[PDB]
GROMACS .gro file of C-alpha atoms in nm:
model
  196
    1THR     CA    1 -11.972   7.912   1.793
    2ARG     CA    2 -11.853   7.554   1.753
    3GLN     CA    3 -12.004   7.441   2.082
    4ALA     CA    4 -12.323   7.624   1.977
    5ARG     CA    5 -12.325   7.405   1.663
    6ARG     CA    6 -12.287   7.066   1.832
    7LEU     CA    7 -12.520   6.827   2.009
    8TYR     CA    8 -12.469   6.518   2.221
    9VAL     CA    9 -12.669   6.212   2.113
   10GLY     CA   10 -12.679   5.923   2.358
   11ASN     CA   11 -12.828   5.572   2.354
   12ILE     CA   12 -12.734   5.528   1.986
   13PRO     CA   13 -12.797   5.190   1.817
   14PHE     CA   14 -12.506   4.950   1.837
   15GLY     CA   15 -12.306   4.934   1.516
   16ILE     CA   16 -12.445   5.254   1.367
   17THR     CA   17 -12.219   5.431   1.121
   18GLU     CA   18 -12.155   5.802   1.120
   19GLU     CA   19 -12.303   5.819   0.770
   20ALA     CA   20 -12.626   5.642   0.868
   21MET     CA   21 -12.665   5.878   1.164
   22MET     CA   22 -12.609   6.184   0.945
   23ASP     CA   23 -12.860   6.063   0.684
   24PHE     CA   24 -13.118   6.000   0.957
   25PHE     CA   25 -13.084   6.346   1.112
   26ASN     CA   26 -13.066   6.532   0.781
   27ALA     CA   27 -13.382   6.354   0.664
   28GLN     CA   28 -13.569   6.408   0.992
   29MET     CA   29 -13.476   6.778   0.994
   30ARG     CA   30 -13.618   6.813   0.643
   31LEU     CA   31 -13.927   6.599   0.703
   32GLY     CA   32 -14.010   6.796   1.018
   33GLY     CA   33 -13.981   7.135   0.853
   34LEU     CA   34 -13.684   7.233   1.068
   35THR     CA   35 -13.420   7.278   0.796
   36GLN     CA   36 -13.359   7.645   0.721
   37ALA     CA   37 -13.200   7.623   0.374
   38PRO     CA   38 -13.127   7.387   0.084
   39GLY     CA   39 -12.859   7.132   0.159
   40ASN     CA   40 -12.775   6.935   0.472
   41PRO     CA   41 -12.796   7.096   0.819
   42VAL     CA   42 -12.576   6.824   0.971
   43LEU     CA   43 -12.216   6.852   0.850
   44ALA     CA   44 -12.059   6.572   1.053
   45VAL     CA   45 -12.117   6.300   1.311
   46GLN     CA   46 -11.849   6.169   1.547
   47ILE     CA   47 -11.931   5.838   1.714
   48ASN     CA   48 -11.763   5.686   2.018
   49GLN     CA   49 -11.876   5.327   1.957
   50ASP     CA   50 -11.728   5.197   2.283
   51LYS     CA   51 -11.908   5.445   2.508
   52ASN     CA   52 -12.229   5.449   2.297
   53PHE     CA   53 -12.265   5.820   2.212
   54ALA     CA   54 -12.229   6.059   1.921
   55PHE     CA   55 -12.185   6.429   1.863
   56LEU     CA   56 -12.355   6.598   1.570
   57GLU     CA   57 -12.207   6.913   1.420
   58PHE     CA   58 -12.442   7.147   1.234
   59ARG     CA   59 -12.381   7.420   0.980
   60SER     CA   60 -12.568   7.684   1.181
   61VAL     CA   61 -12.650   7.783   1.538
   62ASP     CA   62 -13.025   7.804   1.474
   63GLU     CA   63 -13.051   7.459   1.314
   64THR     CA   64 -12.863   7.314   1.612
   65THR     CA   65 -13.117   7.469   1.849
   66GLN     CA   66 -13.406   7.338   1.638
   67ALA     CA   67 -13.261   6.985   1.650
   68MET     CA   68 -13.301   6.978   2.030
   69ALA     CA   69 -13.669   6.913   1.948
   70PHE     CA   70 -13.572   6.562   1.833
   71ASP     CA   71 -13.485   6.450   2.186
   72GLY     CA   72 -13.642   6.107   2.232
   73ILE     CA   73 -13.685   6.026   1.863
   74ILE     CA   74 -13.681   5.649   1.806
   75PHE     CA   75 -13.395   5.527   1.584
   76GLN     CA   76 -13.367   5.151   1.530
   77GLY     CA   77 -13.584   5.094   1.835
   78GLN     CA   78 -13.390   5.329   2.065
   79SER     CA   79 -13.479   5.664   2.225
   80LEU     CA   80 -13.204   5.902   2.118
   81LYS     CA   81 -13.101   6.124   2.409
   82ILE     CA   82 -13.030   6.467   2.263
   83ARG     CA   83 -12.857   6.719   2.488
   84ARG     CA   84 -12.641   7.026   2.468
   85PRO     CA   85 -12.264   6.983   2.503
   86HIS     CA   86 -12.174   7.036   2.867
   87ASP     CA   87 -11.954   7.337   2.774
   88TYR     CA   88 -12.225   7.505   2.567
   89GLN     CA   89 -12.301   7.861   2.672
   90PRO     CA   90 -12.593   8.043   2.506
   91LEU     CA   91 -12.462   8.326   2.287
   92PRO     CA   92 -12.606   8.679   2.317
   93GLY     CA   93 -12.919   8.725   2.108
   94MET     CA   94 -12.956   8.357   2.012
   95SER     CA   95 -13.231   8.139   2.157
   96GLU     CA   96 -13.141   7.817   2.339
   97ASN     CA   97 -13.479   7.644   2.306
   98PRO     CA   98 -13.634   7.487   1.994
   99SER     CA   99 -13.930   7.697   1.878
  100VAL     CA  100 -14.080   7.389   1.709
  101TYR     CA  101 -14.235   7.058   1.804
  102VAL     CA  102 -14.187   6.731   1.614
  103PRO     CA  103 -14.510   6.528   1.590
  104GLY     CA  104 -14.496   6.213   1.799
  105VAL     CA  105 -14.149   6.273   1.942
  106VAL     CA  106 -14.151   6.217   2.317
  107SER     CA  107 -13.880   6.387   2.525
  108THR     CA  108 -13.647   6.171   2.735
  109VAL     CA  109 -13.616   6.443   3.003
  110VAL     CA  110 -13.851   6.320   3.276
  111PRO     CA  111 -13.826   6.562   3.570
  112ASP     CA  112 -13.930   6.449   3.912
  113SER     CA  113 -14.287   6.580   3.950
  114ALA     CA  114 -14.625   6.497   4.100
  115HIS     CA  115 -14.735   6.250   3.831
  116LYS     CA  116 -14.404   6.111   3.711
  117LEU     CA  117 -14.449   5.733   3.697
  118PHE     CA  118 -14.214   5.449   3.778
  119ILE     CA  119 -14.268   5.125   3.582
  120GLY     CA  120 -14.069   4.832   3.718
  121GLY     CA  121 -14.052   4.466   3.635
  122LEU     CA  122 -14.044   4.507   3.258
  123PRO     CA  123 -13.912   4.211   3.056
  124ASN     CA  124 -13.555   4.300   2.962
  125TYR     CA  125 -13.606   4.199   2.596
  126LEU     CA  126 -13.836   4.497   2.534
  127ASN     CA  127 -13.665   4.788   2.364
  128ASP     CA  128 -13.732   5.158   2.422
  129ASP     CA  129 -13.990   5.167   2.140
  130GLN     CA  130 -14.193   4.874   2.268
  131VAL     CA  131 -14.202   5.001   2.628
  132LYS     CA  132 -14.303   5.343   2.500
  133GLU     CA  133 -14.584   5.180   2.298
  134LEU     CA  134 -14.703   4.988   2.603
  135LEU     CA  135 -14.741   5.318   2.788
  136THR     CA  136 -14.880   5.514   2.492
  137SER     CA  137 -15.177   5.276   2.481
  138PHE     CA  138 -15.318   5.466   2.780
  139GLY     CA  139 -15.257   5.810   2.635
  140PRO     CA  140 -15.000   6.042   2.477
  141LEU     CA  141 -14.671   6.084   2.662
  142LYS     CA  142 -14.495   6.410   2.751
  143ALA     CA  143 -14.174   6.232   2.851
  144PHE     CA  144 -14.034   5.880   2.881
  145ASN     CA  145 -13.707   5.701   2.953
  146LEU     CA  146 -13.626   5.331   2.977
  147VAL     CA  147 -13.322   5.268   3.199
  148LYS     CA  148 -13.040   5.068   3.044
  149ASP     CA  149 -12.705   4.938   3.155
  150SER     CA  150 -12.453   5.206   3.058
  151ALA     CA  151 -12.193   4.949   2.951
  152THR     CA  152 -12.394   4.678   2.772
  153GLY     CA  153 -12.696   4.879   2.656
  154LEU     CA  154 -12.931   4.613   2.792
  155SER     CA  155 -13.253   4.719   2.961
  156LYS     CA  156 -13.259   4.720   3.341
  157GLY     CA  157 -13.632   4.646   3.326
  158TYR     CA  158 -13.763   4.973   3.461
  159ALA     CA  159 -13.870   5.302   3.308
  160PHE     CA  160 -14.009   5.645   3.397
  161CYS     CA  161 -14.273   5.850   3.218
  162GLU     CA  162 -14.508   6.146   3.232
  163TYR     CA  163 -14.840   6.162   3.048
  164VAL     CA  164 -14.962   6.473   2.871
  165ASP     CA  165 -15.289   6.440   3.064
  166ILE     CA  166 -15.220   6.412   3.437
  167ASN     CA  167 -15.542   6.211   3.469
  168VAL     CA  168 -15.408   5.928   3.249
  169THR     CA  169 -15.153   5.852   3.525
  170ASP     CA  170 -15.407   5.667   3.739
  171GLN     CA  171 -15.547   5.489   3.434
  172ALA     CA  172 -15.203   5.349   3.347
  173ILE     CA  173 -15.151   5.244   3.710
  174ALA     CA  174 -15.488   5.064   3.712
  175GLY     CA  175 -15.413   4.891   3.382
  176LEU     CA  176 -15.054   4.782   3.452
  177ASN     CA  177 -14.977   4.765   3.824
  178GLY     CA  178 -14.938   4.408   3.944
  179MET     CA  179 -14.943   4.254   3.597
  180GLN     CA  180 -14.764   3.918   3.613
  181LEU     CA  181 -14.508   3.852   3.338
  182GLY     CA  182 -14.330   3.522   3.391
  183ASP     CA  183 -14.132   3.560   3.712
  184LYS     CA  184 -14.181   3.939   3.698
  185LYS     CA  185 -14.470   4.145   3.830
  186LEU     CA  186 -14.505   4.505   3.718
  187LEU     CA  187 -14.487   4.774   3.983
  188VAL     CA  188 -14.648   5.088   3.844
  189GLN     CA  189 -14.679   5.384   4.082
  190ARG     CA  190 -14.582   5.749   4.101
  191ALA     CA  191 -14.204   5.757   4.118
  192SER     CA  192 -14.213   5.966   4.438
  193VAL     CA  193 -14.356   5.667   4.626
  194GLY     CA  194 -14.044   5.450   4.599
  195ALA     CA  195 -13.763   5.689   4.508
  196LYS     CA  196 -13.454   5.648   4.720
   0.00000   0.00000   0.00000
């Protein structure tokens, strides 16, 4: 069950220690009501600092599944990308999906869909949190991801999102499309319009 007790965490803050990561996840699990016993659900964290990802190892299969609900949680300004290990196979009788929701956590999985938005021309100094806030002003998000350079971690200045309310999509477009920001001008439109 080892692969059923591990999770990939991407887009981690630069410089983060394994201990700081563990403390963060153990605290969040407890604060969210996801921890299923006294003591720490996260036993270990292994960070690859060079490639910018971590793996968490949990004490139980069920707590691992619950922790998938933290996908997109902001940690030091960054949207943590939480995913199953690629070799994870659901075991027989165990659920693969978190039965819980974490208030205010916005998933980073933004499937192509009718009202998925593209937001281009963002100033590259804005972090994941600030871009998410910009979009949240119009209404609650179902999903969001800001695209970064995979090697340097710097923003590429464009993002994708999906609002909870499909009708907020056109409100965000009206409020942001064409906004001039220095030498940049926001392009805000359904992602289907310009996808390659």
